[PDB]
Design a protein around this ligand. Structure first.
Ligand SMILES: Nc1ncnc2c1ncn2[C@@H]1O[C@H](COP(=O)(O)OP(=O)(O)O)[C@@H](O)[C@H]1O
Ligand SMILES: [Mg+2]
Lengths: 131, 131, 808
């Protein structure tokens, strides 16, 4: 037994600026912060005005308790290592909201050393510890 | 000074006062203690204070540094458009999630006592509770 | 505060250039798709709001969108907007993460305004739109211009790691000067109350901060001391500004590479003389009058026979006091500042004797006898002249005796009350303006380099384009100055771009230039201009304001730049200025242009026993009026000299914005801010920078950025970096028009760069989920960190709530 409700509540209000309703773009950020990924069809079937209670139910149903951050690295497959500047290249190419500071922080955490490559199993492990 | 001894004697058991009763006396005395002040005197003299330790505690509970500017910081943080206002739900979510979190009834009550309207001037709310 | 004329102007500045992509391939709205609209009940009800944030609803048609307002909070009501009323949104963007407006994906008007707004609200008042620096008045001390901030901006290793600031401009300008031995000019522009004088003073304080001393401290202090002195004598409390500069100011400075002002020169031009005589309600005259009368000691008061602030015809008796302005404390600062300008106690006494004299003369009453001084005021007249070191009998004769030249004979006559009141007023105004100029002239003799400036730092602190209800001659002179400054701006942007392309071997024929040569000519050109015709009418024997307007319409038909008025076609004209059409009122234009002290009165002042009073009109020349004596004629001469000097320098541009008309912090009036964004060419600067080969990055910079467009071509050890780039670009799908390969850089058109960003993103589709989840997980951590910083404060709120509970 490992209830994530209190964490799902706090996360909603960090993204909704403490109001009980959240905008669509910010709901996407919130679900993604818990590793939840939706298809475009699942996105379209969502209510237009998402409230706290709707999210608390959606998170219980969609959150992977066994493997959060399965979309960074899946333990069921194996094929998990990229060069630091290539990873920073991809992060920037996909237009991250993440600043130079944020990225540098992520880098020294998930790569305590200065090893030429970054491990995505280590990224998913570090991010799970931080939940 | 007189009320300090009057309130102590009302809750005193075997010449010593408990931390919960010492904090209650400070509230009765117009002081506003937090878990931090409670943990300070716990670190020094445990959960049962003498009259000397109780007086030293009321000295920690004098937070002269408290004003509208200081208290509004968390509310101001969530007022993204700088209106000087937050809804009752925004403020209830703040008051019940972080810090020495209040119960949902305690928060709802404090807000409902202040205003009848959904949008609260958080500078005026903080000014009111400081009195 | 918001006029309907402001609403009409602001709506004319809005344009829809970027088409909204709200639908997918399937023709379905992107879930949660956000737009900006100018259609909302929030806009009808709040004149401050021009745009609102909406989400396009599932089921919208491409012909008419169905939207719901989300920001400011609304009703949840769906309504329909035409697509010409929807603008792109920069959703999920931190306005504090970068300093230039142009780094935004969408630079439409609602997007620019929002970026500036959210930065302004976080007390980040400086933002660039290269080469311009935008500075929004916070109407509060942010504490960002202290010595700790000067040392920070000056001593920081990598200058590019500092956010935008006026100190960044001061640092860049000083680096280029010493770096390439080239003179620079910092041009500070904006409307009254925008923060120009503050930005100017801030930059001077930056310059006056030396890493390890200034042996020329005596000169620097004299220069720094000019600020209180120039403000006292040339600034006044108007309705729009408690400390409004009523003159244009230019300075040349000699500053060491380490900081420290060594030499300087001050120029003050176009001083509002009319203020000395009358002021509108809720408006004062120059601070000096109030500082002097309120602050002068008993001994000084008895010496000059001073009466109170409410006891002078020249001063409004009802606007004597200003909120947060201590004229007594300011007078003490002014005396100290004059002393630091190396003026003796004797010099300072002459300065204030003349001020006392000007004030006393204003109290002398004239009556109709022909005019005469009231006998009751004959001592008041004598005291005034004694105080101004002028001959009482000779000054009286110039105010009351008229010399007419009928036929070819001089005929002595008398001025009537009205005519004599004008001469007395003219003497008051002339004595003041020349004293103000003498203090500057004296300062310059102490601070200037003996053999002229080799390399200098210029500073211009000037009113921007002015568009009032009634635009007179002063507005015409201001708008003419701003046309010369706009030419300077478009010229340097072009020169800089044209050189870059040339240095890299790219075609300069593709480049665009919008000249204002047409409007400069219609306003200044010798023989064919508003100023040439104003001069001819002033010099003509039967010259009128109506004949001036008529001669303008008759001879300026070659350009649309001159347009005759519709409502009262005579006495009114309209000019097609760069920022749009400005309508002037030619009423009193000839009277205003001729408002310069006449020959014979000047010769009495020159004949004074006092050396300072003898110097006020030094080599003025005796005289009806000659071309070189008219305000506009002297103005165009000075303007050309000033412009030739600036055109020789590397220019820097600070554009100041007044965010509201209430002098309040955190108050944002979009219609007013938009009129300013337009008038200050902030919007044009974005346009200009986006044109042509907008993107330029070194071969290595392009290769790191656009690596995954074609990772094979990018990661090929055999091919050179110049060759790899042509391989990535030829394979991408970009037309050859969209890019050019230079000597050291890849040149891309704005459109080409955006497509190339989108190509690279398609090639890394397998990372989208991974990148989303990492980014969002970090943002959640970052948001909690911002809550953690404020938890000590929250504990205080909670503590007080629980104390108030016990109280019950
Ligand atoms: N950077 C600033 N920080 C704080 N207050 C400012 C700033 N700039 C201007 N102000 C305020 O606005 C007023 C008007 O600004 P001012 O520099 O005189 O503008 P301008 O010369 O364009 O008329 C000031 O007297 C001051 O109260
Ligand atoms: Mg000024």
């Amino acid at each position: 037994a490992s209830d994530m409700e209190e964490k799902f509540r706090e996360a909603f209000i960090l993204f909704s600026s403490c109001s009980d309703h959240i905008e669509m773009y910010k709901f996407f950020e919130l679900m993604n912060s818990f590793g939840i990924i939706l298809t475009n069809d699942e996105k379209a079937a969502l209510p237009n005005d998402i409230n706290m209670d709707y999210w608390l139910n959606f998170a219980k149903k969609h959150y992977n308790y066994e493997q959060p951050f399965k979309h960074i690295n899946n333990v069921n497959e194996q094929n998990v290592q990229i060069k630091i500047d290539n990873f920073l290249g991809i992060m920037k190419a996909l237009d991250t909201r993440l600043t130079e500071s944020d990225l540098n922080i992520l880098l020294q955490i998930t790569n305590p050393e200065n090893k030429s490559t970054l491990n995505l199993k280590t990224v998913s492990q570090k991010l799970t510890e931080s939940i | 000074e007189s009320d300090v001894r009057i309130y102590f004697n009302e809750k005193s058991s075997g010449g010593k006062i408990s931390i919960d009763n010492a904090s209650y006396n400070a509230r009765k005395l117009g002081l506003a203690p937090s878990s931090i002040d409670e943990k300070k005197i716990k670190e020094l003299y445990g959960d049962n204070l003498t009259y000397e330790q109780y007086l030293e505690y009321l000295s920690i509970c004098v937070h002269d540094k408290d004003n509208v500017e200081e208290l509004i910081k968390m509310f101001a943080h969530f007022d993204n458009n700088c209106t000087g206002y937050l809804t009752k739900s925004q403020m209830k979510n703040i008051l019940t999630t972080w810090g020495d979190a209040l119960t949902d009834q305690e928060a709802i009550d404090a807000l409902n006592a202040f205003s009848s309207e959904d949008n609260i001037d958080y500078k005026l709310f903080c000014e009111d509770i400081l009195q | 505060a918001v006029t309907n004329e402001e609403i009409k102007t602001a709506s004319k500045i809005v344009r829809r250039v970027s088409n909204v992509e709200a639908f997918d391939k399937s023709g379905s709205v992107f879930k949660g798709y956000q737009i900006w609209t100018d259609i909302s009940p929030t806009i009808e009800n709040d004149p401050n709001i021009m745009f609102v944030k909406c989400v396009v609803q599932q089921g919208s048609k491409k012909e008419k969108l169905t939207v719901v307002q989300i920001d400011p909070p609304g009703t949840g009501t769906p309504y329909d907007i035409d697509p010409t009323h929807a603008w792109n949104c920069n959703s999920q963007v931190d306005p504090m993460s970068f300093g230039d407006i142009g780094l935004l994906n969408h630079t439409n008007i609602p997007c620019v305004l929002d970026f500036l707004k959210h930065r302004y609200l976080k007390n980040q008042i400086y933002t660039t739109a290269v080469p311009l620096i935008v500075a929004i008045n916070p109407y509060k001390d942010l504490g960002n211009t202290t010595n700790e901030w000067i040392r920070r901006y000056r001593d920081t290793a990598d200058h590019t790691k500092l956010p935008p600031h006026v100190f960044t401009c001061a640092r860049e300008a000083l680096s280029n000067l010493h770096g390439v031995n080239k003179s620079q000019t910092i041009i500070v522009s904006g409307e009254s109350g925008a923060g120009k004088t503050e930005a100017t003073k801030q930059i001077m304080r930056y310059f006056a901060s030396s890493k390890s001393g200034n042996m020329d401290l005596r000169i620097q202090t004299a220069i720094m001391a000019a600020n209180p002195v120039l403000e006292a004598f040339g600034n006044a409390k108007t309705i729009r500004n408690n400390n409004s500069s009523r003159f244009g100011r230019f300075m040349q400075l000699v500053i060491s590479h380490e900081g420290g002002i060594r030499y300087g020169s001050v120029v003050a031009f176009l001083l509002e003389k009319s203020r000395i005589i009358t002021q509108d309600d809720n408006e004062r005259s120059y601070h000096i009058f109030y500082q002097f009368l309120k602050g002068a000691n008993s001994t000084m008061k008895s010496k000059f026979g001073l009466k109170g602030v409410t006891e002078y015809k020249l001063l409004n008796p009802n606007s004597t006091e200003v909120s947060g302005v201590d004229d007594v404390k300011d007078f003490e600062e002014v005396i100290e500042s004059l002393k630091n300008m190396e003026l003796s106690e004797s010099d300072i006494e002459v300065i204030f004797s003349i001020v006392a004299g000007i004030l006393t003369l204003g109290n002398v009453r004239l009556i109709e006898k022909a005019a005469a001084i009231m006998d009751e005021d004959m001592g008041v007249f004598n005291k005034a002249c004694e105080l101004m070191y002028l001959d009482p009998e000779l000054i009286k004769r110039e105010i009351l005796i008229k010399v007419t030249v009928a036929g070819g004979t001089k005929i002595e006559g008398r001025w009537n009350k009205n005519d004599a009141e004008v001469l007395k007023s003219s003497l008051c105004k002339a004595m003041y303006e020349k004293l103000f100029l003498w203090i500057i002239r004296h300062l310059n003799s102490r601070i200037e380099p003996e053999g002229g400036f080799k390399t200098f730092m210029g500073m211009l602190d000037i009113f921007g384009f002015e568009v009032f209800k009634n635009n007179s001659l002063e507005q015409l002179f201001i708008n003419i100055t701003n046309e010369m400054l706009q030419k300077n701006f478009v010229d340097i942007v072009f020169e800089r771009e044209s050189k870059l392309y040339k240095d890299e071997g790219i075609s300069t024929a593709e480049l665009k230039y919008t000249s204002n040569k047409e409007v400069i000519n219609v306003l200044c050109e010798k023989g064919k201009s508003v100023l040439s015709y104003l001069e001819d009418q002033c010099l003509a024997p039967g010259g009128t304001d109506e004949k001036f307007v008529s001669s303008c319409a008759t001879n300026l038909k070659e350009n649309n730049k001159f347009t005759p008025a519709k409502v009262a076609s005579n006495k009114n004209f309209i000019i097609q200025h760069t920022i749009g059409p400005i309508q002037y009122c030619a009423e009193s234009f000839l009277l205003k242009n001729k408002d310069v002290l006449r020959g014979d009165l000047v010769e009495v002042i020159k004949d004074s026993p006092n050396p300072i009073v003898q110097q006020l009109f030094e080599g003025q020349v005796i005289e009806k009026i000659a071309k070189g004596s008219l305000i506009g004629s002297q103005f165009l001469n000075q303007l050309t000299s000033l412009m030739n000097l600036i055109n020789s320098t590397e220019p820097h541009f600070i554009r100041c914005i007044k965010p509201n008309e209430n002098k309040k912090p955190l108050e944002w009036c979009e219609p007013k801010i938009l009129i300013q964004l337009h008038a200050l060419s902030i919007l044009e600067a974005l346009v200009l920078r986006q044109l042509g080969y907008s993107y330029r990055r070194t071969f290595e910079e392009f290769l790191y950025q656009y690596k995954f467009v074609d990772i094979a071509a990018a990661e090929d050890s055999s091919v050179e970096n110049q060759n790899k780039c042509v391989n990535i670009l030829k394979l991408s799908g970009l037309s050859e028009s969209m890019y050019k390969i230079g000597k050291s850089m890849v040149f891309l058109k704005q459109e080409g760069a955006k497509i190339l960003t989108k190509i690279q993103r398609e090639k890394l589709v397998e990372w989208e989920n991974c990148v989303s989840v990492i980014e969002a997980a970090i943002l959640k951590h970052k948001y909690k960190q911002k809550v953690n910083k404020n938890i000590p404060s929250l504990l205080r709120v909670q503590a007080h709530i629980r104390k108030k509970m016990v109280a019950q």
